[PDB]
Design a protein around this motif. Structure first.
Motif, mmCIF file in Angstrom:
data_model
loop_
_atom_site.group_PDB
_atom_site.id
_atom_site.type_symbol
_atom_site.label_atom_id
_atom_site.label_comp_id
_atom_site.label_asym_id
_atom_site.label_seq_id
_atom_site.Cartn_x
_atom_site.Cartn_y
_atom_site.Cartn_z
ATOM 1 N N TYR B 24 0.876 -1.187 0.000
ATOM 2 C CA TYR B 24 0.000 0.000 0.000
ATOM 3 C C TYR B 24 0.919 1.245 0.000
ATOM 4 O O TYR B 24 1.631 1.594 1.020
ATOM 5 N N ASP B 25 0.976 1.891 -1.172
ATOM 6 C CA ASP B 25 1.835 3.069 -1.440
ATOM 7 C C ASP B 25 1.039 3.991 -2.352
ATOM 8 O O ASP B 25 1.320 4.125 -3.518
ATOM 9 N N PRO B 26 -0.037 4.598 -1.828
ATOM 10 C CA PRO B 26 -1.099 5.161 -2.654
ATOM 11 C C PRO B 26 -0.631 6.307 -3.545
ATOM 12 O O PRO B 26 0.240 7.050 -3.116
ATOM 13 N N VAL B 27 -1.289 6.481 -4.701
ATOM 14 C CA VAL B 27 -1.085 7.681 -5.549
ATOM 15 C C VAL B 27 -2.459 8.247 -5.849
ATOM 16 O O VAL B 27 -3.418 7.489 -5.815
ATOM 17 N N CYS B 28 -2.534 9.550 -6.092
ATOM 18 C CA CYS B 28 -3.786 10.238 -6.472
ATOM 19 C C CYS B 28 -3.789 10.475 -7.982
ATOM 20 O O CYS B 28 -2.935 11.243 -8.459
ATOM 21 N N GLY B 29 -4.722 9.850 -8.685
ATOM 22 C CA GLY B 29 -4.906 10.036 -10.138
ATOM 23 C C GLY B 29 -5.536 11.372 -10.460
ATOM 24 O O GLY B 29 -6.168 11.973 -9.553
ATOM 25 N N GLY B 32 -9.197 11.824 -9.734
ATOM 26 C CA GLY B 32 -9.682 11.960 -8.342
ATOM 27 C C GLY B 32 -9.701 10.643 -7.586
ATOM 28 O O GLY B 32 -10.084 10.639 -6.388
ATOM 29 N N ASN B 33 -9.236 9.539 -8.186
ATOM 30 C CA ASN B 33 -9.203 8.219 -7.499
ATOM 31 C C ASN B 33 -7.837 7.969 -6.897
ATOM 32 O O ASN B 33 -6.791 8.219 -7.571
ATOM 33 N N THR B 34 -7.881 7.371 -5.717
ATOM 34 C CA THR B 34 -6.695 6.850 -5.009
ATOM 35 C C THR B 34 -6.376 5.468 -5.566
ATOM 36 O O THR B 34 -7.268 4.638 -5.459
ATOM 37 N N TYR B 35 -5.170 5.252 -6.110
ATOM 38 C CA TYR B 35 -4.732 3.916 -6.582
ATOM 39 C C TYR B 35 -3.792 3.340 -5.535
ATOM 40 O O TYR B 35 -2.940 4.057 -5.007
ATOM 41 N N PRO B 36 -4.009 2.070 -5.116
ATOM 42 C CA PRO B 36 -3.296 1.513 -3.964
ATOM 43 C C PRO B 36 -1.766 1.545 -4.130
ATOM 44 O O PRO B 36 -1.113 1.656 -3.109
ATOM 45 N N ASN B 37 -1.248 1.482 -5.378
ATOM 46 C CA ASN B 37 0.178 1.774 -5.701
ATOM 47 C C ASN B 37 0.309 2.118 -7.200
ATOM 48 O O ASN B 37 -0.665 1.937 -7.966
ATOM 49 N N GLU B 38 1.483 2.595 -7.603
ATOM 50 C CA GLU B 38 1.752 3.056 -8.975
ATOM 51 C C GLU B 38 1.621 1.877 -9.952
ATOM 52 O O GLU B 38 1.037 2.064 -11.036
ATOM 53 N N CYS B 39 2.112 0.700 -9.588
ATOM 54 C CA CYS B 39 1.999 -0.498 -10.465
ATOM 55 C C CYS B 39 0.524 -0.726 -10.815
ATOM 56 O O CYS B 39 0.227 -1.094 -11.980
ATOM 57 N N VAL B 40 -0.370 -0.610 -9.849
ATOM 58 C CA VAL B 40 -1.795 -0.932 -10.091
ATOM 59 C C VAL B 40 -2.370 0.162 -11.004
ATOM 60 O O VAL B 40 -3.191 -0.166 -11.921
ATOM 61 N N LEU B 53 -3.313 10.090 -15.091
ATOM 62 C CA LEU B 53 -1.962 10.586 -14.705
ATOM 63 C C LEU B 53 -1.914 10.664 -13.168
ATOM 64 O O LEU B 53 -2.978 10.529 -12.526
ATOM 65 N N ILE B 54 -0.726 10.887 -12.596
ATOM 66 C CA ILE B 54 -0.595 11.080 -11.127
ATOM 67 C C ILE B 54 -0.566 12.574 -10.875
ATOM 68 O O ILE B 54 0.285 13.214 -11.446
ATOM 69 N N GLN B 55 -1.560 13.090 -10.136
ATOM 70 C CA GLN B 55 -1.599 14.499 -9.649
ATOM 71 C C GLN B 55 -0.519 14.647 -8.579
ATOM 72 O O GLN B 55 0.200 15.631 -8.605
ATOM 73 N N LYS B 56 -0.431 13.683 -7.675
ATOM 74 C CA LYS B 56 0.566 13.698 -6.561
ATOM 75 C C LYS B 56 0.568 12.346 -5.851
ATOM 76 O O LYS B 56 -0.469 11.583 -5.948
ATOM 77 N N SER B 57 1.644 12.065 -5.118
ATOM 78 C CA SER B 57 1.720 10.850 -4.278
ATOM 79 C C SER B 57 0.785 11.036 -3.095
ATOM 80 O O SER B 57 0.339 12.184 -2.845
ATOM 81 N N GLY B 58 0.438 9.919 -2.461
ATOM 82 C CA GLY B 58 -0.560 9.856 -1.376
ATOM 83 C C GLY B 58 -1.982 9.697 -1.913
ATOM 84 O O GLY B 58 -2.231 9.774 -3.122
ATOM 85 N N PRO B 59 -2.952 9.508 -0.994
ATOM 86 C CA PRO B 59 -4.357 9.420 -1.353
ATOM 87 C C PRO B 59 -4.873 10.786 -1.843
ATOM 88 O O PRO B 59 -4.298 11.808 -1.532
ATOM 89 N N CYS B 60 -5.961 10.780 -2.603
ATOM 90 C CA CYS B 60 -6.626 12.008 -3.123
ATOM 91 C C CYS B 60 -7.360 12.718 -1.982
ATOM 92 O O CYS B 60 -7.680 12.066 -1.006
#
Lengths: 224, 60
Positions: B24-29, B32-40, B53-60
């Motif tokens: 669990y290393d979340p990214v914010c698309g 507006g969705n939180t993806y559990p990690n960049e691979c997913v 795209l990734i807006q920023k690291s962490g949850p949205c």
């Protein structure tokens, strides 16, 4: 953990969490001062928490211990996830009791059909986001090398094996990496990767701990 | 911070196994969705032929 159940209190005393701001991986206490987890769980600062059942409401047996030393396998491969293993030296000795205690390394490699117990605070949904408060447990058997290689052609190294169901519905998921796979009182596996979670013919793939027994003790010894 | 200054970045994934690490290393698309990690998020863009795209690291 998808399709599991709430662990009984005192059933996984060796379960730990790795934390950086949040719950990000699991781990297994294998010595009063050492945790084993996945290489992909590496971060330069990690707080280990021991004795958690509910990860949001303190129950009172929790121990909070920062990592002194965080050692990703030196032949860890980010492309293939070969040697997806990591040792954490706790900055102090865990206090051992009924809720916190060690799990034995494996004396022989995994046997097909062996019943294993898988545990963690990772996703419970194959679709969407359902991260539980309560630690999750899964019973799942070790699968043949043939079923494992069929499921993940040319991607299973001799340092990996498969546990779970080809039928899907039950698996480790995101947030479970670094967590334990315990079969017959031995840590046979670490949660590593798969093709989603609980998908048909896509069981979880686990680091084969048996192949690291010598590197684990040697590395612990050298850093004691 | 206007449109060009605020653009997202492309999910970059190193693992080549038709599957993802279970961290669990979340990214914010940018959706507006939180993806559990960049691979997913990579896997998901490939599977559905999307360009989240990734807006920023962490949850949205």
């Amino acid at each position: 953990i998808v399709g599991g159940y709430n662990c009984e209190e005192n059933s996984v005393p060796y379960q730990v969490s790795l934390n950086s701001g949040y719950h990000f991986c699991g781990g297994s206490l294998i010595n009063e001062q050492w945790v084993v987890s996945a290489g992909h769980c590496y971060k330069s600062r990690i707080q280990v928490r021991l004795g958690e059942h509910n990860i949001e409401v303190l129950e009172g047996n929790e121990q909070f211990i920062n990592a002194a030393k965080i050692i990703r396998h030196p032949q860890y491969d980010r492309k293939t996830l070969n040697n997806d293993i990591m040792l954490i030296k706790l900055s102090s000795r865990a206090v051992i009791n009924a809720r916190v205690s060690t799990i034995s390394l494996p004396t022989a490699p995994p046997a097909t059909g062996t019943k294993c117990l898988i545990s963690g605070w990772g996703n419970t949904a194959s679709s969407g986001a359902d991260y539980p408060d309560e630690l999750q447990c899964l019973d799942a058997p070790v699968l043949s090398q043939a079923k494992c290689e069929a499921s993940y052609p040319g991607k299973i190294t001799s340092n990996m094996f498969c546990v779970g169901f080809l039928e899907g519905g039950k698996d480790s998921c995101q947030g479970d990496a670094g967590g334990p796979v315990v079969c017959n009182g031995q840590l046979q596996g670490v949660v590593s990767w798969g093709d989603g979670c609980a998908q048909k013919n896509k069981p979880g793939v686990y680091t084969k701990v048996y192949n690291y027994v010598k590197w684990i003790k040697n590395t612990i010894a050298a850093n004691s | 911070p206007g449109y060009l200054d605020s653009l997202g970045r492309e999910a970059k994934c190193y693992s080549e196994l038709n599957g993802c690490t279970k961290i669990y290393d979340p990214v914010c698309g940018t959706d507006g969705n939180t993806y559990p990690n960049e691979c997913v998020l990579c896997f998901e863009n490939r599977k559905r032929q999307t360009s989240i795209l990734i807006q920023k690291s962490g949850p949205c």
